[PDB]
Amino acid sequence: SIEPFLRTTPRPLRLPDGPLCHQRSKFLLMDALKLSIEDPSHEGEGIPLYDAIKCMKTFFGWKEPNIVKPHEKGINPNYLMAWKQVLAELQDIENEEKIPRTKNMKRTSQLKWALGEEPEPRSLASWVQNEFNKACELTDSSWIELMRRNYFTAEVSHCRATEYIMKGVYINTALLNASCAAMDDFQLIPMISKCRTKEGRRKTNLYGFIIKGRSHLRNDTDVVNFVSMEFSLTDPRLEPHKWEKYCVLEIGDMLLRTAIGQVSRPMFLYVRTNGTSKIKMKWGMEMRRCLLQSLQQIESMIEAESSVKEKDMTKEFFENKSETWPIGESPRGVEEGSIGKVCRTLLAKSVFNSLYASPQLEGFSAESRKLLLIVQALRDNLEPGTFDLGGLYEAIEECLINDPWVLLNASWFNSFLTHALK
């Protein structure tokens, strides 16, 4: 043991100052809007462009598109013309005998510009925690179908994080398929998911479209550029910093029911240039592993409590909400949740690690893990070695530059630290 004044107490991680961080997901998350059809009784796979047109025909408020929030560093007319080109090419498809399996677009000046044919610090914005909260929530629809792993599946089947998995596996598989099939062509790819309502009816959902650029993906690190065009009811003026990488169009009038009654709200199109590597597309196609990762964490956790009682607690926890875990916080203090909330929070964490995969995240994870073990040992009054805390903090803080997900994880780690070493 050493004198108290010489003992090193882990300090809060220092998060960067700067302009607020911006969205960098490959698709919209909480801001997404689905145009949906209730599928036939048979629930037979339609072809994507047929389903996409049929979904767009469920919306009756389409209007002439206009730019409402320009991309600071882009040629905004090119984004506006790209969307008009998508609608013109969909009309071309409608005019033909049959809907085609695939649509290779005209390589216009606007698509060549948009398909190419960050070390500045940013501060943590509120929108990242707001996204994570929404990912933890239950939706009205089921995203998967059902060894007592059915407890877990029951708690996550309707979870929004599960929608993100199904949306990500669909679009990355479709983009890999197009990338192999049509390497030189600008292919129009509907962004689709399938779910089931409370009433057991299957639904097909259209989020928007991506346009694939040139895709000669010889190596895992080779990049395919794409343009994403995504429906939303989110007014870009609420959080402009979130949308720094986007051009936002107003494309329609949506009738919605509210308190005053039925009201018109704008439908927007969030448009950006983006890219992905072959390896990143392959990891996108593996997002179901998020369900297995979070399931394993829940199991490992239930074993601990079952290893205490010398009895399997699986049945008790899921069936009896009485047992709780700390998973949230407010101005008041730490909030505890039933095992179901823990399932959804761990799933959402695993899903967000996939949606926001980065080298900064890999560095943050490996290094923060070492610091977490030191903090746990300090909580337990075990006198861990601290000689390398200087090195550890340098390594962690080099990862805290501008990445929204890494910054939120640092802020979360800090909240944990204030409670852990109270």
Binding site: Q129, C136, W412
Partner: peptide
């Protein structure tokens, strides 16, 4: 606000 690090408190 959900924060999965708070699980480590238990």
């Amino acid at each position: 606000d959900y924060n999965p690090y708070l699980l480590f408190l238990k």
